[PDB]
mmCIF file of C-alpha atoms and ligand atoms in Angstrom:
data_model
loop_
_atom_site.group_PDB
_atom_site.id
_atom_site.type_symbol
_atom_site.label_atom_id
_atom_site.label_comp_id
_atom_site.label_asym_id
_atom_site.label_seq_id
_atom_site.Cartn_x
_atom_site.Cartn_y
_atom_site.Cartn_z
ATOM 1 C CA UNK A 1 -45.349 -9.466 -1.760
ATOM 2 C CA UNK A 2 -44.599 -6.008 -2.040
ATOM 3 C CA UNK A 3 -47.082 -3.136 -1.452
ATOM 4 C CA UNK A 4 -45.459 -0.223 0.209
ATOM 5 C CA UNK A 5 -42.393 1.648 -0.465
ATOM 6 C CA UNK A 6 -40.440 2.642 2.735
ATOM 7 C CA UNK A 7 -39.117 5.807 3.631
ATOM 8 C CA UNK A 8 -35.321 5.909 3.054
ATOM 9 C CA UNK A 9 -33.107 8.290 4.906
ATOM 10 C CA UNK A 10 -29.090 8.898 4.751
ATOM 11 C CA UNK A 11 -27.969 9.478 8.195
ATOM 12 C CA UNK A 12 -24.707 11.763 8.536
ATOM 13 C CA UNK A 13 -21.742 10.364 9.907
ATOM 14 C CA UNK A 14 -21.725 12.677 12.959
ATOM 15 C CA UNK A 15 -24.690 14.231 14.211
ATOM 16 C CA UNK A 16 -24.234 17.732 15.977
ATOM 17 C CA UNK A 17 -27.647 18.847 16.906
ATOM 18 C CA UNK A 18 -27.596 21.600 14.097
ATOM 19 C CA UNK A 19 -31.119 22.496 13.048
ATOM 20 C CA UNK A 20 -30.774 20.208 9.965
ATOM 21 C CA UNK A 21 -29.968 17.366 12.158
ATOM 22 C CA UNK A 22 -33.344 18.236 14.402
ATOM 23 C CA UNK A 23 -35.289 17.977 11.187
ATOM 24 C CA UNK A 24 -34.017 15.022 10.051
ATOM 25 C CA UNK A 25 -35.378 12.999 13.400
ATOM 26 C CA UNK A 26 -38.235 14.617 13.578
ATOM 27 C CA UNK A 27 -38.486 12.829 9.828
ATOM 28 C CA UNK A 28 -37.277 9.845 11.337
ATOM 29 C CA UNK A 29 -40.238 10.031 14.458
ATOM 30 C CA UNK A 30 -43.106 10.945 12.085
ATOM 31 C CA UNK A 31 -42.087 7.657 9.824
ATOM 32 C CA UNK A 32 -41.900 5.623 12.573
ATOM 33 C CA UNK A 33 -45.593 7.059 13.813
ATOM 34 C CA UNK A 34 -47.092 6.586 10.013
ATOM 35 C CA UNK A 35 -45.445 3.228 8.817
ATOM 36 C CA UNK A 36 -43.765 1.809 12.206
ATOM 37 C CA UNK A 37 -40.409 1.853 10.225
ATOM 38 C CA UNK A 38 -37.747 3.388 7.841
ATOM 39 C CA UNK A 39 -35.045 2.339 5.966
ATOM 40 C CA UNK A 40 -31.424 4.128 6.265
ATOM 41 C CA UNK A 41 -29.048 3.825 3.231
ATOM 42 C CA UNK A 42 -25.670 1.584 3.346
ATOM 43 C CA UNK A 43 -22.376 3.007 2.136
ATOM 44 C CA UNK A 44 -19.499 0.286 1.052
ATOM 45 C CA UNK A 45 -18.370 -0.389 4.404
ATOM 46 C CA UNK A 46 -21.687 -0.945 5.978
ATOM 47 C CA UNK A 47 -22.765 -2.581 3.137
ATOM 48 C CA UNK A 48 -19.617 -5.047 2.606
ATOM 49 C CA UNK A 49 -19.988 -5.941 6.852
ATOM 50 C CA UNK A 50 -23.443 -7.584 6.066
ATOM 51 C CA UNK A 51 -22.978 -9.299 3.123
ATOM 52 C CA UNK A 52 -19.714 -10.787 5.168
ATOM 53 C CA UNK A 53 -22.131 -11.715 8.161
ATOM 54 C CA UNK A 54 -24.909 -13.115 5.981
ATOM 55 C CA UNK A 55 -21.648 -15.589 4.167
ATOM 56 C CA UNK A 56 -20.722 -16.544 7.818
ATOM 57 C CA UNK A 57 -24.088 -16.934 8.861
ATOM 58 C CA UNK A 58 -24.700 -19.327 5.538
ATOM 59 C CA UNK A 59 -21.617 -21.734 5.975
ATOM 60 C CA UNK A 60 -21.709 -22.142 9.918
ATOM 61 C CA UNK A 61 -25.930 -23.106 9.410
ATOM 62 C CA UNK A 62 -25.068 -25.781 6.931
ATOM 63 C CA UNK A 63 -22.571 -27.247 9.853
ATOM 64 C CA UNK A 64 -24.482 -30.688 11.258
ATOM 65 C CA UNK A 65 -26.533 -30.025 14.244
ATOM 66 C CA UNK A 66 -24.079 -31.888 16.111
ATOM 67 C CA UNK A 67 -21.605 -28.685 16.286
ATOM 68 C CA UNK A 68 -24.250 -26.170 15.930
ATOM 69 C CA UNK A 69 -25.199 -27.363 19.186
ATOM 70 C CA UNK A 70 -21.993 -27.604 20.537
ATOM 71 C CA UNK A 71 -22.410 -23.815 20.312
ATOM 72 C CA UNK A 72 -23.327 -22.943 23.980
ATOM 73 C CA UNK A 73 -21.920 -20.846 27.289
ATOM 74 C CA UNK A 74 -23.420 -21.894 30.652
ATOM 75 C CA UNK A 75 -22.255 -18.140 31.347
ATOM 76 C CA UNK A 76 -23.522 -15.768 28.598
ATOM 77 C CA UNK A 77 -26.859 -16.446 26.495
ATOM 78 C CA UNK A 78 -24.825 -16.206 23.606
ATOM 79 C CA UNK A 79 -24.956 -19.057 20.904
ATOM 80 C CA UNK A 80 -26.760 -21.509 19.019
ATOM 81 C CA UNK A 81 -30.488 -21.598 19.719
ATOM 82 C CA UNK A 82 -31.996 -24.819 17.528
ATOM 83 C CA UNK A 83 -35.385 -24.201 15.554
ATOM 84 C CA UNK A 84 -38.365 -25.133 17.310
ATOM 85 C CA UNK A 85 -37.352 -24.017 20.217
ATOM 86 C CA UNK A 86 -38.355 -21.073 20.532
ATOM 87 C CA UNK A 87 -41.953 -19.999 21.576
ATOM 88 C CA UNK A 88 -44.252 -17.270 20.570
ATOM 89 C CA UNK A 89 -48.033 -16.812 21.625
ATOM 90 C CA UNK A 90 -47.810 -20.794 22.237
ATOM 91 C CA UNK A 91 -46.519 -21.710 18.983
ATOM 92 C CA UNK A 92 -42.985 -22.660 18.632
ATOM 93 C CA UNK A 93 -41.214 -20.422 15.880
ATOM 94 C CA UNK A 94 -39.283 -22.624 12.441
ATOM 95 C CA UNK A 95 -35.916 -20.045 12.550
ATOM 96 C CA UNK A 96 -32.214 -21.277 13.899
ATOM 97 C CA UNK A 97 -30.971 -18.509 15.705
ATOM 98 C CA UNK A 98 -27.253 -17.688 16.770
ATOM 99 C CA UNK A 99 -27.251 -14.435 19.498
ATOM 100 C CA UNK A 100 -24.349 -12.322 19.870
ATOM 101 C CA UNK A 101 -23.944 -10.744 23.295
ATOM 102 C CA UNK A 102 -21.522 -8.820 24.522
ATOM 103 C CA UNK A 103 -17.925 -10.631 23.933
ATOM 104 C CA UNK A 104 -16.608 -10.326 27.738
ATOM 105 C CA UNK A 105 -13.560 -12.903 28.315
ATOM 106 C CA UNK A 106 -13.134 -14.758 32.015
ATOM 107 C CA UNK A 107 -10.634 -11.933 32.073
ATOM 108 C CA UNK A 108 -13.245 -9.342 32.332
ATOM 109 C CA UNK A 109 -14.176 -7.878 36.193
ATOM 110 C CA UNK A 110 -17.592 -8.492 35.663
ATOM 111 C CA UNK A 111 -17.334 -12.315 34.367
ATOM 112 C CA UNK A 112 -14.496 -12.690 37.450
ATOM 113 C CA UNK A 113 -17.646 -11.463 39.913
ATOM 114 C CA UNK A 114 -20.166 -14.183 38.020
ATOM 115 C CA UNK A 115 -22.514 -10.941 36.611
ATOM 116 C CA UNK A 116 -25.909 -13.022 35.196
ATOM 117 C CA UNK A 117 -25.473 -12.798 32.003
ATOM 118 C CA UNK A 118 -21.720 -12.315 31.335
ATOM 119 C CA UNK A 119 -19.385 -13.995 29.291
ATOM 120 C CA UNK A 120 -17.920 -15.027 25.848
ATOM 121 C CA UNK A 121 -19.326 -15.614 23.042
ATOM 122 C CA UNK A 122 -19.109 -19.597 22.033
ATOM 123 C CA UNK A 123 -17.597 -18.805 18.438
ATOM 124 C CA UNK A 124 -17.884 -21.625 15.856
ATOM 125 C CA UNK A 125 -15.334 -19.871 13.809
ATOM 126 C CA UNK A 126 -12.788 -16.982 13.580
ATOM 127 C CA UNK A 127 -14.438 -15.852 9.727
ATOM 128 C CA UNK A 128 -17.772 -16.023 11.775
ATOM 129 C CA UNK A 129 -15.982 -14.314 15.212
ATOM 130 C CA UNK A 130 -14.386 -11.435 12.967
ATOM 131 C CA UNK A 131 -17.566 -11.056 10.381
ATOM 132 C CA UNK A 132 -19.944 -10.605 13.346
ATOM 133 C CA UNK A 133 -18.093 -8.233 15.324
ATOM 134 C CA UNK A 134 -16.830 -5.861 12.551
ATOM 135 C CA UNK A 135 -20.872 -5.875 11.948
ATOM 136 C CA UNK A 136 -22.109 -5.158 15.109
ATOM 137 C CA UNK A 137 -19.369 -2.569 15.744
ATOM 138 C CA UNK A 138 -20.799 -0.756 12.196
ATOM 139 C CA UNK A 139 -24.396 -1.206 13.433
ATOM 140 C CA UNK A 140 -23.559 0.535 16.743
ATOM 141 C CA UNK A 141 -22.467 3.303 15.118
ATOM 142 C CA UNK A 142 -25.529 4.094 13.364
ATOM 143 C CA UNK A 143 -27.466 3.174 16.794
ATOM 144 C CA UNK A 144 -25.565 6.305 18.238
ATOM 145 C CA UNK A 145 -26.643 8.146 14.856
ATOM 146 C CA UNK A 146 -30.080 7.361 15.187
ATOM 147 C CA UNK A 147 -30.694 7.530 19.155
ATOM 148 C CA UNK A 148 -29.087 11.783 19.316
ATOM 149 C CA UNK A 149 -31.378 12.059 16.062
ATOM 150 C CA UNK A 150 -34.349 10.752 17.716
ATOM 151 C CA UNK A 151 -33.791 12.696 20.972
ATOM 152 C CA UNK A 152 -33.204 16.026 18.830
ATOM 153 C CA UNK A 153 -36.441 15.349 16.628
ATOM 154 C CA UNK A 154 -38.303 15.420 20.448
ATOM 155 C CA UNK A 155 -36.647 18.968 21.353
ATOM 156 C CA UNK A 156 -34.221 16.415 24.375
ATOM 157 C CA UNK A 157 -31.143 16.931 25.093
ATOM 158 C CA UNK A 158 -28.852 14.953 22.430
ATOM 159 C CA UNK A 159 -27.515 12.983 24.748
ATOM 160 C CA UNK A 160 -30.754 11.650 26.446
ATOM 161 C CA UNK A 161 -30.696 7.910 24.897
ATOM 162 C CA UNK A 162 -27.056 7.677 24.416
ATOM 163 C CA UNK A 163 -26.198 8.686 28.043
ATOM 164 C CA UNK A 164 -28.000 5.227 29.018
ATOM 165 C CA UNK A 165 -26.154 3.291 25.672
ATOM 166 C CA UNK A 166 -22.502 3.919 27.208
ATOM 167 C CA UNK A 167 -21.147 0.739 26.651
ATOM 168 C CA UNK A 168 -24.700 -0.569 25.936
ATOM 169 C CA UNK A 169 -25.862 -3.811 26.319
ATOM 170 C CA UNK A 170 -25.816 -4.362 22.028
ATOM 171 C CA UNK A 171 -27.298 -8.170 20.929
ATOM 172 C CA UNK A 172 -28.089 -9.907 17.431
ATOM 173 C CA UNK A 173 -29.948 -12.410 16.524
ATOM 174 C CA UNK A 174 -28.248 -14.352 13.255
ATOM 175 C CA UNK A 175 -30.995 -16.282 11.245
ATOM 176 C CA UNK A 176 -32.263 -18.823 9.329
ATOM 177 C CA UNK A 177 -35.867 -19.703 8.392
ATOM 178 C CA UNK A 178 -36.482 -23.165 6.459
ATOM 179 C CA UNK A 179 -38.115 -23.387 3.842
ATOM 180 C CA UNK A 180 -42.140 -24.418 3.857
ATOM 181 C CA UNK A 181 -42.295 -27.592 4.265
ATOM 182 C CA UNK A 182 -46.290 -28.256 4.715
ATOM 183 C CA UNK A 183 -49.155 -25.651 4.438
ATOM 184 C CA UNK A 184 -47.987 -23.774 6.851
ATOM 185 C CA UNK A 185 -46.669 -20.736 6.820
ATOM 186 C CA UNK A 186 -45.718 -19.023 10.016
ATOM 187 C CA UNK A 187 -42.140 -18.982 10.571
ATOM 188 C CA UNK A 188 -42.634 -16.657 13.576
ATOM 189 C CA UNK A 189 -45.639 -15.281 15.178
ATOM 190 C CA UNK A 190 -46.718 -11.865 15.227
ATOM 191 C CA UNK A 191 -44.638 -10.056 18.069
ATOM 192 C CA UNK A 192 -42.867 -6.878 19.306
ATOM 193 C CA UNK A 193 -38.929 -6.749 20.026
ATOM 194 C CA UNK A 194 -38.278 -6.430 23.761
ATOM 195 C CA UNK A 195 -35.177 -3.275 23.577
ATOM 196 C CA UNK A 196 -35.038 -0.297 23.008
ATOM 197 C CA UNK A 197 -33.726 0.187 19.014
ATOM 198 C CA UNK A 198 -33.891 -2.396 16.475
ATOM 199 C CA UNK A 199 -31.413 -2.124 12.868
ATOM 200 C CA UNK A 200 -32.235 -5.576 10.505
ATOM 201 C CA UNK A 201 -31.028 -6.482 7.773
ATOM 202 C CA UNK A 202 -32.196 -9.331 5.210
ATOM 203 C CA UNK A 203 -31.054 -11.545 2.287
ATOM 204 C CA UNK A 204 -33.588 -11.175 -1.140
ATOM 205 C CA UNK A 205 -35.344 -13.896 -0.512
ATOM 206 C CA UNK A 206 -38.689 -11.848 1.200
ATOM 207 C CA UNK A 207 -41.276 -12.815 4.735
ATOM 208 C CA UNK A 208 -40.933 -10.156 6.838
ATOM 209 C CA UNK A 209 -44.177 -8.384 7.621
ATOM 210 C CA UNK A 210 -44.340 -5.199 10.058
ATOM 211 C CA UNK A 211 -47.457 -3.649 11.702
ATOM 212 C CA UNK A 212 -47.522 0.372 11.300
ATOM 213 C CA UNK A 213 -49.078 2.050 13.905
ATOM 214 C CA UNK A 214 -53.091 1.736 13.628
ATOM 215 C CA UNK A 215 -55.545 4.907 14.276
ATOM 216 C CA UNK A 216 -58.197 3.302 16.634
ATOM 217 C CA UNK A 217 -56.511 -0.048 17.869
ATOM 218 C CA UNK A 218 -54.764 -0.268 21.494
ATOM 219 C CA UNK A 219 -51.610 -1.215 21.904
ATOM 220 C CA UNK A 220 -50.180 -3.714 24.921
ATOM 221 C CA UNK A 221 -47.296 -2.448 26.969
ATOM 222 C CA UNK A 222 -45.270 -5.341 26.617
ATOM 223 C CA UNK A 223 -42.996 -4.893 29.321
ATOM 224 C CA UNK A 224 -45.252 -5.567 31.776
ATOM 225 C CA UNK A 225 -46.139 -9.450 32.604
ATOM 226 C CA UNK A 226 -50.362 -8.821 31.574
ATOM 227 C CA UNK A 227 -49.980 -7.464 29.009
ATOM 228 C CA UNK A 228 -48.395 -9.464 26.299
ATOM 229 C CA UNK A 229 -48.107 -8.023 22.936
ATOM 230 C CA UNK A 230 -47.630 -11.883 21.521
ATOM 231 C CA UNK A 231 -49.645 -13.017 18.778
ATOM 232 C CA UNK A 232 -51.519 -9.755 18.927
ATOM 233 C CA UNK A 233 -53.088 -8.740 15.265
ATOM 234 C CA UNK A 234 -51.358 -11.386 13.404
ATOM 235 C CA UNK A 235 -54.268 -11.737 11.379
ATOM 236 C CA UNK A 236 -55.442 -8.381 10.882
ATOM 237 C CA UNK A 237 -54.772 -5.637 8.613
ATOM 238 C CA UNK A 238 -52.645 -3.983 7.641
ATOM 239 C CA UNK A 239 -49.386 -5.657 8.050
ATOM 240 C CA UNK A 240 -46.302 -4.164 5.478
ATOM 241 C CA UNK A 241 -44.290 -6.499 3.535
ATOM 242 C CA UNK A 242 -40.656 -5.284 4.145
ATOM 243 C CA UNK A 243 -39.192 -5.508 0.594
ATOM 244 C CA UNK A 244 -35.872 -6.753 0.516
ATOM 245 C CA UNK A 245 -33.808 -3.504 -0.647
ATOM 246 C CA UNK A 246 -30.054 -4.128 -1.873
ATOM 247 C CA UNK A 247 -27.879 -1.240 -0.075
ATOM 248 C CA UNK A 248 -30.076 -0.383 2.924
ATOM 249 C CA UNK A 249 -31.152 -1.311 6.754
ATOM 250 C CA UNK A 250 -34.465 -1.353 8.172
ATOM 251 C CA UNK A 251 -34.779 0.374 11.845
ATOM 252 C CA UNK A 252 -37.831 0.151 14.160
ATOM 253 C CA UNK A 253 -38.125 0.801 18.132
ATOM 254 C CA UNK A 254 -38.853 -1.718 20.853
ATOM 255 C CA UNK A 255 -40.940 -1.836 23.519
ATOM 256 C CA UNK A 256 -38.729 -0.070 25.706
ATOM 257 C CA UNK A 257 -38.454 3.109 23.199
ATOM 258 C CA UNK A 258 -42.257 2.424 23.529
ATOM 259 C CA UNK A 259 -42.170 2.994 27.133
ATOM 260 C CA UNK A 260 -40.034 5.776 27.139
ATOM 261 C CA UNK A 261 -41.889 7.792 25.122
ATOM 262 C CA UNK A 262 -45.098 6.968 26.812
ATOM 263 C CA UNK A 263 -46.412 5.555 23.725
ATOM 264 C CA UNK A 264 -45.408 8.567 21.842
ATOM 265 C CA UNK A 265 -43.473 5.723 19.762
ATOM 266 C CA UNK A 266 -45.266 2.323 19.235
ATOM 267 C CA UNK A 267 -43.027 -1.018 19.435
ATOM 268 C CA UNK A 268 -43.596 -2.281 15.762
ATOM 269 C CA UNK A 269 -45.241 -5.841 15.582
ATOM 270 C CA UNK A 270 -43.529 -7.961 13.211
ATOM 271 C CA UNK A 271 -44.032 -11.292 12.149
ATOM 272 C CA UNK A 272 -42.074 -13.922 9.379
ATOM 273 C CA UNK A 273 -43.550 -15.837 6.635
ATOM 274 C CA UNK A 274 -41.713 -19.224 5.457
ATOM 275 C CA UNK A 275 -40.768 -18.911 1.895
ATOM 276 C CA UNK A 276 -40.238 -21.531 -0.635
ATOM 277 C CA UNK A 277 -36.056 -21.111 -0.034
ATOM 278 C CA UNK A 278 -34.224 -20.585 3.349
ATOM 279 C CA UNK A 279 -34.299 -17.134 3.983
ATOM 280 C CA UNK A 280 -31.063 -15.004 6.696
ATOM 281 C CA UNK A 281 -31.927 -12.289 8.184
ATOM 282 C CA UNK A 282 -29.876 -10.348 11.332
ATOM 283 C CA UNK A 283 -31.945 -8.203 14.153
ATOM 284 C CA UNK A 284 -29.714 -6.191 15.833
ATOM 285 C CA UNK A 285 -30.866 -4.739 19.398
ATOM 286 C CA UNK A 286 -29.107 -1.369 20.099
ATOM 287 C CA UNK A 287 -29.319 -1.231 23.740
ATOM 288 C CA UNK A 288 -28.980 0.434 27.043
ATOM 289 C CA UNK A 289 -26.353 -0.641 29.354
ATOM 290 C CA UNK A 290 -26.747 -3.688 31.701
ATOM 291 C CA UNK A 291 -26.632 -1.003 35.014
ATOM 292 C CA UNK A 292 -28.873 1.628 32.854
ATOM 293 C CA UNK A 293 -32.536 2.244 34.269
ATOM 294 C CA UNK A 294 -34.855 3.462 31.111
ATOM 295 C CA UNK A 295 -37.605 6.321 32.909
ATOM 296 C CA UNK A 296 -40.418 8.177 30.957
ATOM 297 C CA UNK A 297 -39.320 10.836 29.248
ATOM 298 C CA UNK A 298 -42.617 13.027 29.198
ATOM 299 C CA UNK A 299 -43.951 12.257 32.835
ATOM 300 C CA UNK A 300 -41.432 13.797 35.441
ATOM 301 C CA UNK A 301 -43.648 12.652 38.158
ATOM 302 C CA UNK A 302 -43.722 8.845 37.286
ATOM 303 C CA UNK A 303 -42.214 6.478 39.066
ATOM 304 C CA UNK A 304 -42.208 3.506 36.876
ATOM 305 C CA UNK A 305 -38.491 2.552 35.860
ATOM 306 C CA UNK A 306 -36.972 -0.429 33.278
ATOM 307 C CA UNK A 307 -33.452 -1.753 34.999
ATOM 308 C CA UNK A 308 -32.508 -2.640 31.484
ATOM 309 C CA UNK A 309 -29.999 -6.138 33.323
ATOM 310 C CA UNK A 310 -32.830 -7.183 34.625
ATOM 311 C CA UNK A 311 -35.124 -7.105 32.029
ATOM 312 C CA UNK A 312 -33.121 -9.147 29.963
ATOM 313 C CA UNK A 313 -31.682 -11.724 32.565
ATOM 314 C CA UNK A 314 -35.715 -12.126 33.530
ATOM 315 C CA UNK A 315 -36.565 -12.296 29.206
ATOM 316 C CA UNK A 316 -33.709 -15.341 28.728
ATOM 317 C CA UNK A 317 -34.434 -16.980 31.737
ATOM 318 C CA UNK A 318 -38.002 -17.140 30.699
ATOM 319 C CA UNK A 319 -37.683 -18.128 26.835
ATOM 320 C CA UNK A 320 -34.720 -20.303 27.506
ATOM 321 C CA UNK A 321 -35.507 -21.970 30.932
ATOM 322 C CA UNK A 322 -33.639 -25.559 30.509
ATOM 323 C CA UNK A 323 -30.853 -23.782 28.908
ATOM 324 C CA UNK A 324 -27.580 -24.077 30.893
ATOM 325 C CA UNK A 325 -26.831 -20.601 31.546
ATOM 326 C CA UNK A 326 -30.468 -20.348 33.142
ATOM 327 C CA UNK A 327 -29.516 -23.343 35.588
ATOM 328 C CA UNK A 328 -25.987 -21.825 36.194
ATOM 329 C CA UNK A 329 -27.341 -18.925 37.187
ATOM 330 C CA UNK A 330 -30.259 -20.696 38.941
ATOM 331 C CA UNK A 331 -27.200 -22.893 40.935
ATOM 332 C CA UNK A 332 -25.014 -19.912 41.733
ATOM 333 C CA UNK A 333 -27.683 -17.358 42.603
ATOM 334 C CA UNK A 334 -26.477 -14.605 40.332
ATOM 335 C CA UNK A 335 -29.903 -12.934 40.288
ATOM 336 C CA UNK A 336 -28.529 -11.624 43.901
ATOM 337 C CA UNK A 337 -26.141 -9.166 41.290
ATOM 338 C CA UNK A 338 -29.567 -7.312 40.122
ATOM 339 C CA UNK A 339 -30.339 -5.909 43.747
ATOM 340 C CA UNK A 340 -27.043 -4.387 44.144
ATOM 341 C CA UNK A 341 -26.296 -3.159 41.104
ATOM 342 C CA UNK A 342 -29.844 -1.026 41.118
ATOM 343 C CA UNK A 343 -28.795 0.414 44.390
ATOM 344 C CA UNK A 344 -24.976 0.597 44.528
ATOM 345 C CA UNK A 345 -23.911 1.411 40.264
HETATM 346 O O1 LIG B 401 -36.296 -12.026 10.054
HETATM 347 C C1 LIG B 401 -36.377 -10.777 10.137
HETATM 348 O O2 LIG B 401 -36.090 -10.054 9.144
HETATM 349 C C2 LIG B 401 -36.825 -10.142 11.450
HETATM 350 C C3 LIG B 401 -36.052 -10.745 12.621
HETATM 351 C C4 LIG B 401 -36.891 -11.835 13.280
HETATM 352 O O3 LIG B 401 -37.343 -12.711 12.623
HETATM 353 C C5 LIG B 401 -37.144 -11.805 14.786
HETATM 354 O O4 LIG B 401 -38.101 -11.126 15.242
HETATM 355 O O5 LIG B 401 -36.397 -12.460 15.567
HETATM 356 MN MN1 LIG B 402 -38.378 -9.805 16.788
#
């Protein structure tokens, strides 16, 4: 139920570093450190690409489970993930989730050398192949808008983020949560996104709760194994109803803007309550490439790095382990890729 009002930003087309542009993300930064997220406004085409995605998303989910789960690559993560599934904190989470990874054909070098990871995308449709990528090609453009924002609004060098987004490792999770269907409520437990950016969008149905940052409570580092972020707070105020907005995305950073900020910039909890109808949503993951090491931006001195290939490979093997790209690349050792490419990219 709604309660706050998001800040709402238009983002120009190009951004130059002028001292308008430096402004505007350090707007962007101080929203993100009072409310944990902003909303930036749509124009037609950016608009028109998610209403098209949310009409894929709609027909292929009322497909029978039968060819849903036909949906599958033993080589790329990408595909049908069935509700239930999925765990958070211990509690498996009610959505139906197709992921879009990056669309590489067996023609591709990198599929050719078995890459963990690597391959194309199990399409259950051309409407949903073409309505997906026109989508995720618009939201990657305004990844690039917001990432030389954000680096200008810390006095960096524009190209800080988007020198390690070159061909980035962009994903999106395509949704549906039931309806309730019993007194309970949680259609995913409270939790922090894993990347670096994240751009949603929603239907007008309503669930999606956020956690702005909170003077006085500790945050987990997420990205390292003891410290967990799951679960955390999920109770606890104050948690921000996202109102569904018509002609605007939501944007929030991930534990590994998080990290490179040195906290600076808090990985916003979120967290999905069932409504009485279905509700789609998309979370798109602007991210750095497979090969790309994220480094602390504020502490020359510190050695700690994120190899952003193998934080992923190691996140899907873990919450997918009996899926079969984790056995393929279980069978045909492809972790060995991850030691080479840190040393010899
Ligand atoms: O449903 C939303 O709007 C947020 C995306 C989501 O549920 C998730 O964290 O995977
Ligand atoms: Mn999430």
């Amino acid at each position: 139920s709604h309660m706050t009002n998001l800040q709402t930003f238009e983002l120009p087309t190009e951004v130059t570093g002028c001292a308008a542009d430096i402004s505007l993300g350090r707007a962007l930064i101080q929203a993100w450190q009072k409310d944990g997220i902003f909303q930036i406004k749509t124009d037609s085409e950016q608009d028109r690409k998610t209403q098209e995605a949310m009409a894929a998303s709609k027909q292929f989910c009322k497909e029978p489970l039968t060819f849903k789960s036909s949906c599958v690559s033993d080589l790329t993560y990408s595909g049908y993930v069935a509700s239930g599934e999925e765990v958070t904190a211990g509690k498996p989470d009610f959505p139906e989730i197709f992921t879009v990874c990056k669309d590489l054909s067996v023609g591709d070098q990198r599929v050719k050398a078995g890459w963990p990871c690597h391959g194309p995308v199990p399409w259950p449709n051309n409407t949903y192949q073409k309505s997906m990528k026109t989508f995720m090609e618009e939201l990657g453009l305004a990844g690039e808008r917001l990432l030389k924002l954000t680096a200008l609004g810390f006095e960096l060098p524009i190209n800080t983020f988007t020198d390690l987004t070159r061909d980035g490792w962009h994903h999106m999770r395509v949704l549906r949560f039931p309806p309730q269907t019993s007194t309970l409520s949680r259609g995913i437990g409270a939790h922090t996104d894993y990347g670096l950016l994240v751009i949603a969008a929603q239907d007008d149905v309503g669930g999606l709760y956020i956690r702005p940052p909170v003077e006085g409570e500790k945050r987990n580092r997420n990205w390292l194994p003891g410290e967990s972020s799951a679960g955390m707070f999920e109770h606890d105020e104050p948690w921000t109803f996202v109102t569904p907005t018509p002609g605007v995305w939501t944007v929030f950073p991930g534990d590994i803007l998080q990290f490179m900020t040195g906290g600076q910039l808090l990985s916003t909890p979120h967290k999905v309550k069932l409504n009485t109808r279905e509700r789609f949503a998309c979370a798109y993951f602007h991210e750095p490439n497979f090969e790309a090491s994220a480094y602390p931006l504020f502490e020359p001195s510190a050695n700690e790095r994120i190899h952003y290939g193998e934080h992923f490979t190691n996140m899907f093997m873990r919450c997918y382990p009996d899926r079969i790209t984790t056995q393929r690349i279980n069978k045909e050792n492809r972790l060995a890729h991850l030691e080479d490419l840190k040393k010899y990219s």
